Design a protein around this ligand. Structure first.
Ligand SMILES: *[C@@H]1O[C@@H]2CO[C@@H]([C@H]2O)[C@H]1F
Ligand SMILES: *[C@@H]1O[C@@H]2CO[C@@H]([C@H]2O)[C@H]1F
Ligand SMILES: [Cl-]
Ligand SMILES: [Cl-]
Ligand SMILES: [Cl-]
Ligand SMILES: [Cl-]
Ligand code: NA
Ligand code: NA
Lengths: 659, 659
């Protein structure tokens, strides 16, 4: 066995297989290689019949493992062998393991692959590494799926209905699969993931140039590998996360950097990535942004109101569109009646054309002067105001629809024919924004702007055009927001609408929300709830009780998103948000979310600590529970130490009034 | 233009294509054939080279349409043509349309199919029939997906967040796909579906011998047919539901019976099917069941309590398992403290072996005498009691696990390796129940029984063993319940736990729950909320406010399902269910749900009328809304006319208690 070692880690590399283990010397924890099949890697490729097959590369005809430098081991896997015994002759995979000379860090890189007459697809490498043993290790997989989740490596008490779904999911295909980097759907928002138990944590940071996918396996024993064979899995229930190198697509450096943290958990992982986030240039702080624009300080303690008038979906839809006088009256009621001190008013439906033609201000709704009156009222309160804007859509129901603004692929076929809100090629989008955005800023005296869709993901295709549009918008020095966001867009915006949770998502029944993105970026970007899943709607992610408490724990702002006819029903939630969430949001807005903890066995009682000196404890479940020192946190209740030392305690109650 | 006609309907058949239109003569509404491609059917088959392809059978080499009887048109589609222009020589499809001589009914049947040297797969027939034109027809598709949904054929006001998800789904793949019959997952619980507008309704009833799937298209313009070609759809947005006949699987009669109802909607469709359900033998009324077993009358007004002790998933799990003294005390508190007058107490975790060995009563939890003391207390209150029972599982973590009782397929391979709760071949399950159920009934003096899993679906494989188990359990004449249920099992049970809604499901963002199943079967089977989505959990299907109101509208009972440590947090919801839902459930339990209506344009305010003389109006949304007479229904509010003349009015309120 070839050995790489420094003061902190011992890497054992098996000469016959290329599998490796990592001993964290301070704790004695041994991170094992593939516990199921001793596969260093899992390679998907075509066979001589051209059928796709997945092979264990440790069963290749030739394995070369040699220490090519003091802290480098080079591996070569030559001529993999298929299940039927034939050989992918001429296929080879070359990899390196590079141990940092001083730090508990191991770089793993796929340096070369050769296809011969075969075609190569996925490479899980390292395969099924750094795993946790279900119900022995007491820890979790750590996955930055949108705001982030952890998946515990053991069964624990919880509501019986949740418990049945949870446990059942670890025995079927709900607990295995893959996710992608940097989308606004089911995927990850940071290029890292990890596992930890009570002794030890490990995380891998993907090279900035690469886009692997991430395979997950959450307490599954691999039965999915045997169902078509009709046999019971002989493997043990484990937790693992693997990089999937897309060999047919990947043009970057296929490197992942593993960091080993003694006694660490998801918080320590987040803080390690935060240093890398700064090095990558993503981290531009809200204090810096405030220095550049004092109007940033109208965000702390602001409720984000989206007044949804059926636009961009429809122009002047009966029963949904607001007039401009109606808009003004809603703004006035929020301020005078509901005593909301700070607000971001976002009015969806101000233009009489479909996006991406964000103009003119609609005559039917009252015309420019009446909109200006509504905006001038909001400004006189110190509120932020934006209309709905988007430069990416090309809508079937728009009379100005044209495929001329769309993008075509290498075969000349239109792209995103099935995705109406993102059809305009990004290379056109600055020109579309240029048609009226400066005239609207000038006429309405705008201080803020929110733009939909274009910055919700960070994909390679079209990236140059999105950056161009980001720089143009950012040049006006408005307080500016965008839908969902990604870490790459943080330098160009002050707030993200979203960066929370999908309602229906892989892992939902076997994970707990964790503020992983905000543990990294809360000082650099303000986020608010997603308009599709706002705090006034009851969804898979909770009711107002749950969402308000999670808001304070995770450091996000309140989102009230409503059609105009609902407004009267919004009042109690605006009031409770005003009284409970807004002062905590205000106090913690610029600070670092230093730590988050789960304080109860069922993960429902949590504690967050902000560098403002603010501490938030909240109980997101129905039953009072005790924490350290016998303090009891009521169901749907909270206990908050503010910066000045005052203690706030309370809870939400659901009542039935009977006439 | 061959014609079938009677006094109520006019069927116009095209001789060149086989497409037909139906004129419903009372309203004059015309149901058109395929508005997109003039396809009578869509046939999926392999080509010369073995690739699956889907063809328009109206483009076949030869099409014969002849009136072959007074009210029968026979159609023949010979030699379908592929898209490249090659021919499926020797493939044919024969169909018939048979108009009832007197009634507004049209039978449609695939009588013969010949495959030659190709392989036939799916046949949509009739294809894209009985469609609604989006935003022109004001109506809905009607789909008995579990309890049932309707899918409006037009955009309407709703919460802004729901609105974006709704409208967006009609432009992507969320609005197209297929469902299956008689499963406990995403599928249909009754073999019918339909469409209606403001003039007329049509529904199709599938032959009892057949198992087609159901294709849906909910306001989609068919862009999904063109995404791979990378062009824009030229078709218009429509709603349709099609039979999918699985030609490679189907052994029954491929017949569907269309019924045409002037001025009808989903209520009228349900009542049409209710006649066929009685004819099929499914409909055994709760009044007949009460005549056989007076204890059935302990169900009306009962809250269904599941005390989830971590079983069947684990035996005596720390932090989840209850002792029998603890169980007794929970029962005592529910009665003496919470004043719950009627209840079904369901204790999950009473045996020291894993299911399917439902014995012995656990010594570790206290032994048989202490369990008897709990059951005796329950019975002294007039409560029903059951342990958790299941005879279908074969669990990996059971020390007695064996593949001996699992089913194998023709190749000797284990079946359901992926589905741990349904592994025991149903031909063994009566014998497994016989091992101890009679001893338990005898020793505890049981009056009730609930069984998990076995009767949640109605599949062909294993049906006879399931029927044998059902007859055995039914022979004890206990009040008996089962998980989920299906219409075929109604003769054997008094209550179904479930038959409501999955949390995550196809159509969820573009449908409204409608009590289709209970509109048919409320007089015949009692249902309660599903244990995984109980009324005390906040999920995609609502919080307690929404679930309690929907309970009274749809005619189901309350389900409070909790781990023991949660019990104190359940108190407020038990009290609210006690005061609001229980008296309405009690009054309406045996009655027919005569009618259901949506009274607001956002479908949140609804009215149900029961044949007990009870009318339930409730508002499942946040804002007060007015109905006829200018009566206002508060947000999360209700207006209930009871049989005794009293009018119950009230609403739920969320409040913030800041200490
Ligand atoms: C029946 O089936 C399985 C076992 O118990 C639960 C579910 O997890 C019940 F729903
Ligand atoms: C941005 O994208 C589309 C359009 O508006 C919504 C969504 O439907 C917003 F989220
Ligand atoms: Cl875009
Ligand atoms: Cl959040
Ligand atoms: Cl079964
Ligand atoms: Cl329901
Ligand atoms: Na800005
Ligand atoms: Na019975």
């Amino acid at each position: 066995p070839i050995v790489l070692e420094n003061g902190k880690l011992n890497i054992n590399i098996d000469s016959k297989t290329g599998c490796f283990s990592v001993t964290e010397k301070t704790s004695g924890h041994v991170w094992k290689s593939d516990p199921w099949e001793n596969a260093a890697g899992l390679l998907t490729l075509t066979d001589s019949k051209g059928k796709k097959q997945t092979v264990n590369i440790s069963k290749s005809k030739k394995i070369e493992v040699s220490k090519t430098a003091k802290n480098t081991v080079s591996l070569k896997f030559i001529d993999p062998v298929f299940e039927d015994g034939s050989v992918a002759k001429g296929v080879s995979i070359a990899t390196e393991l590079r141990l940092d000379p001083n730090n508990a860090q191991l770089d793993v890189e796929v340096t070369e692959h050769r296809s011969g007459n075969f075609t190569l697809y996925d490479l899980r490498y390292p395969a099924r590494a750094f795993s946790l043993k279900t119900d022995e290790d007491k820890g979790a997989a750590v996955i930055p799926q949108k705001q982030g989740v952890i998946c515990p490596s053991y069964i624990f008490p919880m509501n019986g209905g949740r418990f049945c779904k949870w446990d059942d999911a670890t025995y079927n295909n709900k607990s295995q699969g893959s996710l992608e980097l940097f989308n606004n759907g089911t995927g990850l928002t940071m290029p890292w993931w990890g596992t930890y138990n009570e002794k030890s944590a490990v995380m891998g940071i993907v090279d900035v140039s690469a886009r692997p996918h991430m395979q997950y396996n959450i307490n599954n024993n691999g039965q999915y590998l045997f169902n078509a064979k009709g046999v019971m899995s002989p493997y043990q229930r484990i937790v693992f996360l693997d990089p999937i190198w897309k060999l047919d697509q990947e043009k970057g450096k296929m490197r992942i950097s593993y960091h080993f943290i003694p006694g660490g958990d998801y918080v320590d992982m987040a803080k390690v990535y935060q240093k890398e986030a700064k090095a990558r240039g993503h981290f531009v702080s809200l204090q810096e942004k405030l220095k550049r624009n004092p109007n940033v300080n109208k965000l702390p303690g602001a409720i984000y109101f989206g007044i949804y008038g059926g636009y961009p979906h429809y122009v002047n839809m009966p029963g949904m569109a607001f007039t401009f006088d109606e808009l003004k009256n809603i703004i006035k009621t929020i301020h005078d009646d509901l005593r909301v001190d700070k607000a971001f008013v976002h009015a969806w439906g101000t233009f009489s054309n479909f996006v991406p033609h964000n103009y003119p201000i609609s005559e039917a709704l009252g015309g420019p002067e009446k909109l200006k009156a509504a905006v001038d009222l909001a400004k006189s309160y110190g509120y932020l105001y934006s209309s709905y804007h988007a430069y990416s859509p090309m809508l079937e129901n728009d009379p100005n629809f044209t495929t001329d603004l769309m993008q075509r692929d290498a075969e000349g076929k239109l792209m995103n024919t099935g995705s109406r809100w993102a059809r305009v090629d990004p290379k056109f989008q600055k020109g579309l924004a240029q048609k009226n955005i400066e005239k609207e800023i000038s006429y309405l005296g705008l201080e803020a702007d929110i733009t939909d869709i274009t910055f919700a993901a960070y994909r390679e295709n079209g990236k140059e055009g999105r950056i161009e549009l980001a720089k143009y918008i950012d040049s006006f020095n408005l307080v500016n927001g965008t839908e969902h966001g990604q870490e790459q867009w943080i330098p160009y915006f002050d707030m993200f609408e979203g960066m929370t949770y999908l309602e229906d998502r892989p892992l939902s029944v076997i994970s707990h929300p964790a503020p992983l993105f905000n543990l990294v970026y809360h000082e650099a970007i303000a986020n608010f709830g997603k308009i599709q899943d706002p705090d006034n709607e009851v969804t898979a992610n909770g009711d107002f009780r749950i969402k308000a408490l999670r808001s304070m724990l995770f450091g996000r702002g309140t989102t009230i998103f409503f059609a105009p006819y609902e407004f009267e029903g919004m009042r109690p939630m605006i009031e409770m948000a005003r009284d409970l969430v807004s002062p905590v949001h205000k106090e913690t807005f610029y600070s670092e979310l230093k730590s988050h903890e789960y304080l109860s066995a069922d993960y429902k009682v949590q504690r967050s600590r902000f560098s403002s000196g603010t501490e938030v404890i909240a109980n997101l479940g129905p039953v009072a529970q005790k924490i350290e020192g016998g303090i009891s946190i009521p169901g749907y209740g909270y206990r908050i130490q503010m910066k000045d030392g005052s203690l706030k305690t309370g809870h939400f109650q659901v009542s039935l009034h009977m006439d």
